[PDB]
Structures are given as C-alpha cells and as structure tokens.
Amino acid sequence: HYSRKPQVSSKTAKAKIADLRCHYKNTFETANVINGMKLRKAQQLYRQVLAKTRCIPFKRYNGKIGNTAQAKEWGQTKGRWPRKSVVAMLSLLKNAEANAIEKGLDPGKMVIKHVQVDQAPRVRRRTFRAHGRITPYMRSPCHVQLFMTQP
Amino acid sequence: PKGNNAIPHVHQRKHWNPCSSQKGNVKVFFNQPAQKQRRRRLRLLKAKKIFPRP
Amino acid sequence: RRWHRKINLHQKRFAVVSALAASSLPALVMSRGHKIENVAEVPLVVEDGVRAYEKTKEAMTFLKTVGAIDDVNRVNDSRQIRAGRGKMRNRRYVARRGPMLVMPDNKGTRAFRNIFGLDLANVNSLNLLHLAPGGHVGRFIIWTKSAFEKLDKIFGTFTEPSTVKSGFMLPAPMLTSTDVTRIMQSEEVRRVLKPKKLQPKRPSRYRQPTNGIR
RNA sequence: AACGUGUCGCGAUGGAUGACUUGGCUUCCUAUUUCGUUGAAGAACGCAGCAAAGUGCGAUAAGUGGUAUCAAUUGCAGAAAUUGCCCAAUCUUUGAAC
RNA sequence: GUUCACCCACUGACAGGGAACGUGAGCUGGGUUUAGACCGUCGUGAGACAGGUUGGUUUUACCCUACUUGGCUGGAGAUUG
RNA sequence: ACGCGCAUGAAUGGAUUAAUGAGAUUCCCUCUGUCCCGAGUUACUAUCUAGCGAAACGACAGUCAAGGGAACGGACUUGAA
RNA sequence: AAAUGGAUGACGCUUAAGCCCCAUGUGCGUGAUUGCCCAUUAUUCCUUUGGUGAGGGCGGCUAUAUGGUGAGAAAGUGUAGCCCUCCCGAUGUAGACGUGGCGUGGGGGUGAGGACGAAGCCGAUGGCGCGAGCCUCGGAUGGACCCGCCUCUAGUGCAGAUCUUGGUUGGCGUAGCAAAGAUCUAACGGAAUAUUUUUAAAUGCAACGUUGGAUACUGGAGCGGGGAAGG
RNA sequence: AUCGAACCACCUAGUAGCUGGUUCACGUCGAAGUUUCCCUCAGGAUAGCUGGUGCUUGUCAAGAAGUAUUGUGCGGU
RNA sequence: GGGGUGCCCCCACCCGUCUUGAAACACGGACCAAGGAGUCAAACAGACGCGCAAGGGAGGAGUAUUGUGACAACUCU
RNA sequence: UAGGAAGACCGAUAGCGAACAAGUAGCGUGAGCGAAAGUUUGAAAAGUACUUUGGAAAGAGAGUGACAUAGAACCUGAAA
Ligand SMILES: [K+]
C-alpha cells in the first residue's frame, strides 16, 4: 500500500507496480532523481538519458563505479545510464498520466510529490564453482509507487 | 569425598532398563485393581452356574 | 516412576476425624466459602423421610425449606469454561463444590441425583477427598437422623473403642482448655505478674545538648 | 555541499507469538478373535462421461447379489437411487509357484 | 646450497653492523625434514644413523590502514551567536 | 694416479663391458635478451559502458613515537598529527 | 660507543621551578602551642539492611453526629514489617545456607472478568519496588477466551557450547561472465517505433526471428551419414 | 572420488583421571594450593582451612589469651 | 516530577574462559526468532515435619460397594 | 481382527519419521537412507460484474461483505 496520503485527493493521480523485474539498486537511483520535478520535465530527462546526453546520479549504491563529466549538473562525480530501469519508469509515468486525464486534471501542470522504491521478494537460481561447490545466484526485484498533484 | 557410609551392593549391572537399544526386563502392576474386579466377577458367575453346590 | 503413595492407617483415620469436627463450627464453614446464612442450626440434622422421595421436584422443595438452596444456587452460577489447555483434554467445564448429604447406606438417591451442585455420601465409608476439598476443612454437611445416630458406633468415644475400626479411639487433646487468652487474663495469673514501672516523659522539641564543655 | 549518524509517523522483507486440533504417546478391559496348494503375504498391470495422484475394485473391474433404512449424488454433466451391514458370486499377470 | 672460506682482477676504497638472526599472499626451492630406491656400519628382525646418494604439488587480496598518483567539496564560535 | 680401506671385496656376487637410456655429473663447438641493460610492437584481459551477478571473510574497529604491561598495543600513560 | 624520531610525564626552569637543611594566618628578632590542597580513612548527621541485639506500650469508660483535629494499635521468626526509642556490624573468587523473594505450563479449592471487546502484539504511557518484576494509559491493533489468592505438581527462566533449525545480512551492483577466428546489409514479422507541447541532429536508446545478397569457418581421423551401451 | 584392513545396518547414547558448555533476584557467612598413602606426579583417599544444624551452660566469666611480669628449667647459632 | 534529543567540564582498555598472572600479538565471539543441559528408580546415613511407642508397620490377597469408583472404606483367638 | 474405557501427557522446530496424494518426493550399482509441508479467507464465495490506461502482467475507479490493511495457500502478523 501507499505509505503517504495526498493532501488534496481530488487533484491527485496515483500509480504503482509490484514485483518489477528490474535491479532494485538501479531503479532506486532512477526513480529518486525525479522527486519534486514537473511531469513533462521528468519525461524529458528520461529521454535524454536514453540518448546518453545526460546521466542519472548514483548517490547511495555507488561503490566503485566510474566517474563522468555529465554528473556535474547534480553536484557529484559518479553516474550511469541504466536503460532497463529508465524504460520501466517511463511506462509507469504514462499510466499515472492516463489516471490524471480520466480524473479531469491537466497533465501539463502536475508536479511529482511522492516516490518510493522498496525491495521485493527474491528469486533463486544457482551457479557452479570449483571443487564441486554450488552457491546462490539470486535476483532482486522491486516495488515502485508514486503520485503527483496539480497545484 | 566419600565419608563414613555403608559399602553399597545395589546389584544393578545388567540391562534391565528399557532404552533405545535394549528391550529391558521389567514388571509393573498397573492392572492390579482391574484384575481384582475380574476374579470376583468370575467367582460370582461360577456360583450362579453350579448352584446349589458349595 | 513412583505414582502412588502409602499412608499410615492411624494417620488416615486421624485426618477424617479432624475434618469432621471442623464441619461443626459455623465460622470455619463460612470461611471455606459456603452460604449458610439461612440455616437453622449446625450441624444440620433432618428426618429420615427424605429417603422415600422419587421426584426431583420434591427434593428441590425440601432443599428450599431447610435453607440449603443458596449454596446450590452459588454452584449453578459459577459454572464456566476452564482456562488453558485443560479444556482440550475432557475437562471443559469447572464448577464449585456445594453441600453434601449423608445417608445411612447407598439407597434412596434417585430423587437427589441429577441436581447440579449436590453431593451424596454414605456414612459407612466417608471420603477425606470430599470432606476437605482442596485440602481446606469446613465442608457444609446435611445429616439424616439414621446416619447421624451411627457416628458414635463408627468412630467411638474418648473412652469406648469403636466397633467398626479395630481398637480405634479418639485421640486425647494436648490442652484441656484451648482458650489461652482467658488464662493470660485470669486473676490467678495476674496475681504473680511483675509490677509496672514509671516511664520517662516524651522528648519535646529543642534537642538536648551533647558538648559537656561548651 | 554531498555522503554519513540519530529520533518519530507510515510502508516493505519474514513468518515468530497467541488462540485453535478428525493427529501422536501411555495405561486398562471385552470376544463364537489368529493366514496358505480349495494357491497366502508381497509385487505388476488395468477399470469412472469428463479421472494425474490417492481410495475402492478385477474384463461381472469407484462394482453384480441379499438385507435393514427410506430420497438422494453434487464441480459440471447425466438420471427421476444412496448409505450401513452381509450370506451368493466374479476375481487379469505373477509369487511357496509346482 | 651455503653464511663462512679461499684465490684471480680492477679501484680512491673494495669498513663493520641493525631493522621479528629486515624482506616466501615479493620471487626462487639448491639445502634441511615425509612417502620410492641404493651403499657402509649397527640390529636375530621389523628397522636405526646430527653418515653418503638420486627423485620428490610453494594456495587466496575485491576489506581496513600505510604508500603512490587521481578528482569533488565545505569551513574562523573550525558547520552554531 | 696413490692406498694401514673410521666402516671395500667375491651368486649378502667381485672386476670389466660394445649397443641401449624423458637416469646422475664435467668439459668443448655452434647459438642465442640468461645477463651487461633494457627498448619497441601484436592478440586477449585489466580499465569505461549495457545486461546479469557470487564467494571468502566479518567480537568492536582501524594515524604514530616512547613507556610500562603476559617481557613486540588500534584501545591504557605522556607527547605528536 | 648503536641501530624508526623522543622523552626528569611535557613545556620549561639558573636572584631555580636544581641539591642539603630551616620556618609559617592576620604583624617572622613585640600575636608561644593549626600557611594551604586532594580519599570508599576518622568525627558528626540522615536513611537502609542484618543482629549472640537492648529497653518500652498492648485488661482500649474524658468528652465529643453530619452539613479542637483524624487516622491506626495484630502477645508478634519471616510483609505494605503491631507500634516507639537505643547500640553494634555491612566489600569479597571457589563454596555453603536463608527469603509470607520474582517469573512459567498443568491439578485441587476459593473469588472475579469478557463482543460496551479475552489472549497475543506495539510504545518519548507513566507509577511502584534495592532487584528479579508488577500495575495503569494509549493503539487511527486484534477478534475469543482469561486472571487474583491458598495449596499440589513439572519436559519450569539463556548471550556465547568451531551449539541445532529457519530467516536476515556488510563485503557489493563488487570479483567476474576473456580456449574452439566473425560477422555485414535490405525487406518482412513483432507491443517491442520514426513514442516530445512544456523542421530535420543536438529529447525512444539497445536488442530479437525469417528470406535474398555478401564475407568467412568446419576441410572426409568433419559442428557429414548410420548403429551398440545408456536415455 | 573410500584401503598399513572396503561399504551398509546393528551391539552403541561404546569408555574418556582430558577440551568445551551449564538459563532469575536480594541477604548472612566465606577459603585452599599444605600433611600421610596410592603403577602415584593433568587424578584420588586422608587431616587441615569453611558452611549449616545445634547441645550444655554463663553473664562478670568454668577447661579463656599468637601479650606481659615474677619465679624456676632447656639450648650451642 | 518523569521521558526524548544534543551540548559543555570531568571520569572511563573488550566480553566469556583456562591461568600465579588477560586490554592482550592466548582460545570462542556477523545479526534475529524458536529450541538447548543435575533427571527417574533402588540401598544406606544425617538434619527437619507428622503418627504411635516396648512395640511399629505391612504386602499379597479377600469382604462389601456408573456411583468424584484404577478412588475411598473394612479384614481383631 | 473387531470393538470399548480413558489421561494432573504433547500441542505443528513439540508429539510417531509421517495431524497433509509419508515410508511419499528425493539419494545410492546395491545392502540401505529418507524429508519439507496445518489449504487456519469468510457465518455464507457473496472469490470483485462494469468503465478506463495497458500487448500482457497489472494500475486507476466501481461493487460484495460489519471489517478487503479478511483478495485466495488470504486468522493474528514479532525481531533482525
Ligand atoms: K557498467
């Protein structure tokens, strides 16, 4: 369920997805950067990341990743271009836009007010190691929820 | 430390106790009151059948 | 494992006698928990005619007449479902112990069975587990006249041995008079008590001094 | 600045706790109570309208016959018997197997 | 195999030592010290010898610090008054 | 070559032997980056990105000097960063 | 005369802040007999706890309604200690013993509670006890049982055993996914595009199958065509 | 995938003077590493040190003293 | 008065363990939940509770009973 | 083999290995070895018609039910 309640429910659209088959750490960085942005601005940023003109800043899960000149606009040095997480977030933003249109709001004035990414149940595989050993090979999905309001 | 005690002769060095590896060798008397009732009932039945012999 | 126990024969007869004497004191009966506020006299002795009853309604009318219906009502209200795992092991309901009616034999109990909160007993074999439930003395007992008159022969007196128990006599008391407060306040004792002595005044305010030089 | 640290409200991950119990364990009693060449115990293969496992049954194959009870079965069909008990029967390939 | 030793040669000079007898997740594995085998001496024998001889797997750093380079960024009440 | 041989020696076999040996040892010719003394180049890695994604290990942690201490301290005393 | 840079503890100190010795308030050759600082020690005071503890009261007649003052008093080892005075001790490993000392599952008694909400669970909910713990409050938690007191009984209290069984975890988006040479192009297919409102490039990347064409490999002891064992 | 005595089940929870562990609170007391014997030297028995339960008594003192004084003996550092 | 979070001056070696001696460059120690170790029987001794006493106490059996009935009661030249 | 009486016993890591398609799945050439797992939603499936975005999975509304943060291996729902 949603962990927060919008202040004016009439002028607010919501969307969420569960057990999304994308890396939790990558999706965590991708979704967190658009908090407080306008809806059209967030869509523009994702399109430019796909073109590899701007980058997503990695702030928490960034141990020993490369440095980029494109991360300077975020006041940082490390960044990346996760395409699998970006296309998933673009699909989710389209669903929230459809909900706003059906409710009667204007998508060109909405502002993203809440973003949250959580860890989902893991899926198990296995890999074969030297000297006849077997060790886990696990997948880490995630949940995503958001809503946006019209000022 | 042992003090002034009697010298023990408890006689319990065979496998009498039932455990995971031994059947044991024991006898209990949980059927004592039930068998007391059974013997009396048989005596009463026999008296009725052989009446009037002592 | 040693499940059962042995008890000396004389000690078992001692306990039964003591639990019977406690039932004649109305203070101990009330302390155990019975309601005897309407009972005419203790111990309660009624006529032999109660053995000829055949209908449960007659028994209920008799109980209300002698004033013993308050205790059976108390047992009726206390019925409830047991707490804990015990209700899973054929012990679902619990209730309290009511009065006990004593008969000269094991006959004439058809009308008194099925009454909830009443117990029947035979004077020829009295059970300590029934006379002192939970280990506490002072059970409420109703006697029939025939059963009451047999108590002297069954248990014997302080000088005459019993006729049913081989060579049994009531144990002698340790004290010829249990009233100890009377002895302490008697005139004979007060004659030889040491006289009282005058005591000092209570200390006032203005704590006393200690420096003997200054 | 950012990272990091801490507290409160909410949400994830996980399946403890409590209350439940057609299961287990232990003791006691009663019988017109003790298998097989007249082929047993075990083992294999099959059988339902839709039926994999399990249950029942054997080419008369989720059953034929007798008796007591007295209107169902039930997921959907389908019809206008079912359930308990038991005498009469059927009883595939094997197995002491001859 | 040597530390040690001893010779040849150059030189101004070929001083003496320590750092877990510096230094094996730096190397090498000649020696020492398994299992195979030969010799001498010893033992009745299985076997022994600080006697000789030949053959005999050298594993793991992505963590913290130290060191080397490489960048981002606050801050004088050393974040506040 | 020599032999007072700690402790050589005759089927516990002595001595010698052409041919043979992935057997042990010494020297010579040829040859070379083994070395004086290192330099340049290629392919795959490492390095950056997309997708995917472990293990080992893990009391707590991680700047030094001297001191004393279970006689070689990250923590204790004094100093210095 | 020694092996990292370093030690009267450091700075520093030379009419000493060094060595040997002598003194003391206000006033040091007229103030005789205390210059000042720091203990789990000594004196004194308050409170607790245990005694080889020591004393005292306990036969309730002065008199008194509410809207001269109001509550208790148990002949007692042990308490919410019957009450009031006084004296002496109090640390401690291995170990012994005591406790009307705490807590858990079930039996016999007694007394209550519950759909106007039991058990369980949550907490910047406070109060009580030296403590084990007990109780109240709130739940925008739960949905059916449970507890106080006296006794009986036991599979009765966890932080570590390279402990057992589950779950979670930093390391970490890290180490890597590097033998067998290699793919390119157009059309079609596909939801996988040529996806923008706030001219074209600088704002929808990357990747998949078939057919035609190109390039190249296996090189007959073959990534050819048939069998046995095994499946 | 096992050999200076294979594998499976059982006797078997084999024995261990040796290593590891052993779950609530407060209160009153509180040590020893020494003697003799033991195939005894990483262990026991035995006396000593300690706790509990007391018994018989006394109340200023019996059968008191890790101390003096007086008298009288012992000794070869 | 209590509770929460910072700040200042002062104080303050890591727990469990064997050991004469542990903060140790001595061993076991990533986190949480639920489990996890002086028990039962038999012989004897001492302390304390209870009954009787120059006597004490049975056992096995037997007699009478859908009733709290596998209990309880009784069994003497 | 048919039945009965029960219990100061255990209460899903306990009690038989097995409260469940358990001597089953699985392992070993073989003799043999051998689990995990309460379907405990709700009184009753009344188990979410229909609108809309989406290839689908699902999301946003609507509806049943006293409660859907009782939505399907669905009571309660702790700690890390
Ligand atoms: K990358």
Ligand SMILES: [K+]
């Ligand atoms: K990547």
Ligand SMILES: [K+]
């Ligand atoms: K990558």
Ligand SMILES: [Mg+2]
């Ligand atoms: Mg790297």
Ligand SMILES: [Mg+2]
């Ligand atoms: Mg591999």
Ligand SMILES: [Mg+2]
């Ligand atoms: Mg393999």
Ligand SMILES: [Mg+2]
């Ligand atoms: Mg029998």
Ligand SMILES: [Mg+2]
């Ligand atoms: Mg044949």
Ligand SMILES: [Mg+2]
């Ligand atoms: Mg040296």
Ligand SMILES: [Mg+2]
């Ligand atoms: Mg060295």
Ligand SMILES: [Mg+2]
């Ligand atoms: Mg090495």
Ligand SMILES: [Mg+2]
């Ligand atoms: Mg070396």
Ligand SMILES: [Mg+2]
């Ligand atoms: Mg080294």
Ligand SMILES: [Mg+2]
């Ligand atoms: Mg060699």
Ligand SMILES: [Mg+2]
């Ligand atoms: Mg010789």
Ligand SMILES: [Mg+2]
């Ligand atoms: Mg000869």
Ligand SMILES: [Mg+2]
């Ligand atoms: Mg020879």
